[PDB]
């Protein structure tokens, strides 16, 4: 493809990206670095601070899911489940904007989303993190890495792998226009189990890949091997997802009332 076509593609994705995802990285970092006037986020970092933090199940509008009732751990667990469900809907919409996606076999569309969704959620989760913690609730709060790490039994090992990934990933300094293309590359993966027609998917990915490569050269002229460092992140996402699935299995064994949202059960049933 010609550069103009690659630029058009990248601009198209950036626009539909801004329109699918309310909270962008730019808006997230602006909040983390405290360079955006409109109330700073409350820091929840331990039991006593969380209690004071009624930004999850209290004084505001009862939206965040769970409220002590059955421990702080179940709390957070359900909160992420909910954040996960909103992303799936956003990602699903964003995917429909990728040129060629809605023209693929419906079954393959479903498969690509089934496997791509969590890789994308963790990719975007990195935008809400920094070495010390993660933003929670549209940016309305901030839970520390140390605290999440202290949760009881296996619950305390859920976020750490994600923080490790975010730090290395954030080191690449990608912006939303970069991420828009990267995310599309992840969706159009022709190696997902159960795909019916691989070629159409691969052909589209090749063009997205070339678009991304050009985007990075232009957007980050001084960073060597960035294209390769970024694609490398796609195999790291495989490990985070499988590792996460395993832990969800430990919770399922050590807790009779696991209870998962139907959209996630559907996605998680027979994954990898």
């Amino acid at each position: 493809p010609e550069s103009a076509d690659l630029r058009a593609l990248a601009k198209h994705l950036y626009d539909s990206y801004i329109k699918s995802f309310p909270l962008t990285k730019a808006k997230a970092r602006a909040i983390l670095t405290g360079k955006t006037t409109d109330k700073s986020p409350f820091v929840i970092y331990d039991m006593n601070s969380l209690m004071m933090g009624e930004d999850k199940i209290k004084f505001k509008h009862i939206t965040p899911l769970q409220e002590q009732s059955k421990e702080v751990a179940i709390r957070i667990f359900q909160g992420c489940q909910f954040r996960s469900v909103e992303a799936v809907q956003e990602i699903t919409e964003y995917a429909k904007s990728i040129p060629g996606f809605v023209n693929l076999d419906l079954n393959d569309q479903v498969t690509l989303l089934k496997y791509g969704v969590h890789e994308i959620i963790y990719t975007m989760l990195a935008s809400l993190m920094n070495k010390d913690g993660v933003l929670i609730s549209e940016g309305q709060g901030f839970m520390t890495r140390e605290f999440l790490k202290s949760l009881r039994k296996p619950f305390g090992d859920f976020m750490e792998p994600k923080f490790e990934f975010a730090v290395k990933f954030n080191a690449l300094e990608l912006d939303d226009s970069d991420l828009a293309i990267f995310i599309a590359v992840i969706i159009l993966s022709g190696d997902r189990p159960g795909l019916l027609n691989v070629k159409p998917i691969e052909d589209i990915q090749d063009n997205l890949l070339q678009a991304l490569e050009l985007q990075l050269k232009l957007n980050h002229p001084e960073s060597s091997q960035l294209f390769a460092k970024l694609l490398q992140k796609m195999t790291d996402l495989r490990q985070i997802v499988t590792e996460h699935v395993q832990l969800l299995q430990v919770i399922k064994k050590t807790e009779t009332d696991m209870s998962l949202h139907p959209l996630l059960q559907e996605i998680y049933k027979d994954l990898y």
Binding site: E93, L106, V110, K114, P262, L263, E266, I267, K269, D270
Partner: peptide, 16 residues
């Protein structure tokens, strides 16, 4: 498998 809700989202989307 089936994936009922994923199909729905792809088909229509999500309410307000």
């Amino acid at each position: 498998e089936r994936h009922k809700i994923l199909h729905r989202l792809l088909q229509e989307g999500s309410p307000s």
